[PDB]
Design a protein around this ligand. Sequence first.
Ligand SMILES: O=C(O)[C@@H](O)[C@@H](O)[C@H](O)[C@@H](O)CN1C[C@@H](O)[C@H](O)[C@H]1CO
Ligand SMILES: *[C@@H]1O[C@H](CO)[C@@H](O)[C@H](O)[C@H]1NC(C)=O
Ligand SMILES: [Zn+2]
Length: 1014
Amino acid sequence: CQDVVQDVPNVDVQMLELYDRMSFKDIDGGVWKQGWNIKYDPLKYNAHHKLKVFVVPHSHNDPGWIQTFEEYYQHDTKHILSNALRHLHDNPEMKFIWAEISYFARFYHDLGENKKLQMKSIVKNGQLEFVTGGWVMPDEANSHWRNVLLQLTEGQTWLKQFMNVTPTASWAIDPFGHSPTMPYILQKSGFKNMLIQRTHYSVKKELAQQRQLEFLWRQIWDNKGDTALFTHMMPFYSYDIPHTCGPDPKVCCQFDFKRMGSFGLSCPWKVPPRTISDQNVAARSDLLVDQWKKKAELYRTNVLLIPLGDDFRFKQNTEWDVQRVNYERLFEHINSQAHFNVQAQFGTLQEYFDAVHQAERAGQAEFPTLSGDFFTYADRSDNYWSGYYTSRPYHKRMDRVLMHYVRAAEMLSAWHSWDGMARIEERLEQARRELSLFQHHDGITGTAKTHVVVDYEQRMQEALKACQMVMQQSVYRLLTKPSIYSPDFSFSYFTLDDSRWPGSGVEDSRTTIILGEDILPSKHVVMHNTLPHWREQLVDFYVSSPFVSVTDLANNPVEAQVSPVWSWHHDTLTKTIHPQGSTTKYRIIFKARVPPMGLATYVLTISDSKPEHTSYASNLLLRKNPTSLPLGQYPEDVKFGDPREISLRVGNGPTLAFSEQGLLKSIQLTQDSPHVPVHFKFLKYGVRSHGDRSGAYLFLPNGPASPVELGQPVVLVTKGKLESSVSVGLPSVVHQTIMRGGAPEIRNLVDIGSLDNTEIVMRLETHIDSGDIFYTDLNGLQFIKRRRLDKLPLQANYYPIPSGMFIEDANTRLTLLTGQPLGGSSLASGELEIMQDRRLASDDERGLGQGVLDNKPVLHIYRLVLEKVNNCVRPSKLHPAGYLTSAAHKASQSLLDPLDKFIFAENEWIGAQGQFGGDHPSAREDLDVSVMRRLTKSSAKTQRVGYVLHRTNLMQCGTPEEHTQKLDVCHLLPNVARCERTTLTFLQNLEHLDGMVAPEVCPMETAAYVSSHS
Ligand SMILES: O=C(O)[C@@H](O)[C@@H](O)[C@H](O)[C@@H](O)CN1C[C@@H](O)[C@H](O)[C@H]1CO
Ligand SMILES: *[C@@H]1O[C@H](CO)[C@@H](O)[C@H](O)[C@H]1NC(C)=O
Ligand SMILES: [Zn+2]
């Protein structure tokens, strides 16, 4: 195993280091606005050394953006694919590449048998080539690596099954900036090459000058280079034809033959394309070859990539003809004129890369190594695209909730084979596809039109119902005596109880468990733990009486706490946002202990008075002019007081101090230790008056953020033995700090309401000497070092916070973990800030054609971890990575993969069992079973189950925390006959494993295994 902490990799280009030295000046470079006037030596090419040009036709099909997936399919894409099949079938030298498998699958299944055979032969013969092969071309900023892998797998599994091909070349031309998480997943999925486009214009200029646009991209912590994936970064401002033939768009536009008039389209540089003929072909070729040779100067080999395409192109039959025939004329003339020393032809992406690598092996070139990422993207001037790190935050949070449900449904149902009548495969397929579709760079990114966001949300809501049905049927099967198990596959044995989604305040969707001495006295509840180690976590349920006690299934009492159910309302009468307590239901809380990847059953029983093992929280309402708050049968009266500082401590954990406005002020780790200043504050950013306006994509603040005026907010304090909290109703936000004895949990119920042209940010102010350094994660997979640069505007210093961020000095670290991707930064030493929501009334000119005015209440969740780190073994000052401690990693896990809760729906569960998985191995804390998926249907003689194992890297800080079982996923299910290491998509066997034992992986590595069973 490589050491990912102490050996700083030596690479030719390290993006953080490049960022430190680069100038980022935005000067007019001539026709190539953001470059320079390229020049070439005409004698560089001759008969023995020609320029091989590959023109690769393509069509960017967004799965939802301005139209919904289905509307684009009906009005556009089905015609693109139908005409592609026809044209390629009839024109054998023509080529075309295809990226979005969601669309291709949709298409293919509406095809007649004869067309399917035709389609398969143009794929087999190489004319139609799939690039990447993912269900979509995912966003790279907000997406979790688990879902990037999920959608890549959904598309490639479809391609292998139906087209019998697995792409090894990736094409990502539209994501708004790029992540090293991609080469990481791709390289472990059999890929050999990848292409990217949207990177900072300054970076493009800088790398082009050094001919470093093609590089071996390795992970920032990879000293050896085993993760390296050859990468081609396109050099210009866009992937359209005007910006892909060469440096001058006025010239390249004349070579987009769809712009002569009958298609509506035109050249904004004022010169239109003209049909090629014998009279003008020489003059046209002169212009075109000149462009190619200039573009060729920016790269190292004599092989040139020339994409030919744009959004939803190759739709009309006449369009196929006008592009094909004109380019064929150009090719015939150019290739026959020795003096150009050029051999040009239509080609595919893989043809291009194969030719480049042949040249490389011929010693014609050597490529540089690079590590780092490509965020935050700006396509021009000061237009940094950091607004989409936060846009439509409701759905961003929904993404993470569905990510987890999918994982839990596939894992719970993988333990058995199911009869087709149960429709398990069918429901999981739908859940996987709706979630995969949302990874699209206009889905999770929050950059689609209002009704298209609605379409994605409705699809994820059906996916969530599908997962719940699979999960509850599975739990019923795993915890009912076999000889009693009698399933009705359309019945609800259990209903899921979720405390954080949609969230209290967003939607009253939780069911109350109704008990009564004169009716039903008890109720079974079941917790599932998808993680591969024993886990204890407090779980809460709503009950109809405060007098309830908890037992495990051997009837051992379990300590519990009951609290009122508090909800907040903007009292548009005394003009306050204040809490109300339920007089009809209550919350019971207790610690559930659940086996690794297993289940645990508990029983809640009502009594007529205080039970022996249940305690009650005290409640304090702080506001001047208080009024009473009745709580039905709750046994303790609410206490009142004037606003004041307060301090709390649950168990032996930290003591937190709060301001009189109910916000965190300081944290004291132990009895003795000091009160570390850590203050939460909410501020707002506005939009510029004149000039470029912020929009769904762009964040263009009219200056630093200004404090939200709070007034005298109402603070609610709940103090219990197991859980305490401090909640405050602020304008636009009900902010809550919850304590269970470890790092606190923070929840914000954000409702920007009608605050047009406003972005609400949540900031943490500390005195940690962080300087200009901070850390953010990439796709929930790794943490990268960021350096705030004052030579860049504020918006350029915002980065994706997909799951976490932290700042530290020599002794102290503050890490903020999130349950949803949002934008964020450290704008000053000791500060961390993360955007909560943004309402924008103007369009930001990137084609969306609307602002963001469809905001809705959303419950954001976080864990806040203050830690001493002077004793931790950290990477050197020069290392570009950072790593979490054990506590922060477990805190991220508690947000992304909590215990699932099921309430038995009927009165009596006959044959109920108390636990499942008590014999599963409890693996080391840095190891996770990211995916567990049965890959075969029940009629298959040999069952196959796939596992994706991921090991993160946690800092050594002096806490032994040892003694753990080795997890061998291949022996989790009985009767194993074979165990294989495979690509992460499970599509290719890479190693036959001895003894059918799957070894554990190294820190920061991810592996896949498939176990076969008789
Ligand atoms: O085709 C052009 O005119 C290009 O410059 C592109 O603008 C092209 O429309 C496309 O990339 C626009 N992309 C499409 C969509 O997926 C994005 O949100 C959006 C952001 O601008
Ligand atoms: C699938 O591709 C393989 C090459 O790996 C080929 O040998 C096989 O015949 C193909 N199967 C089908 C259904 O054409
Ligand atoms: Zn796009």
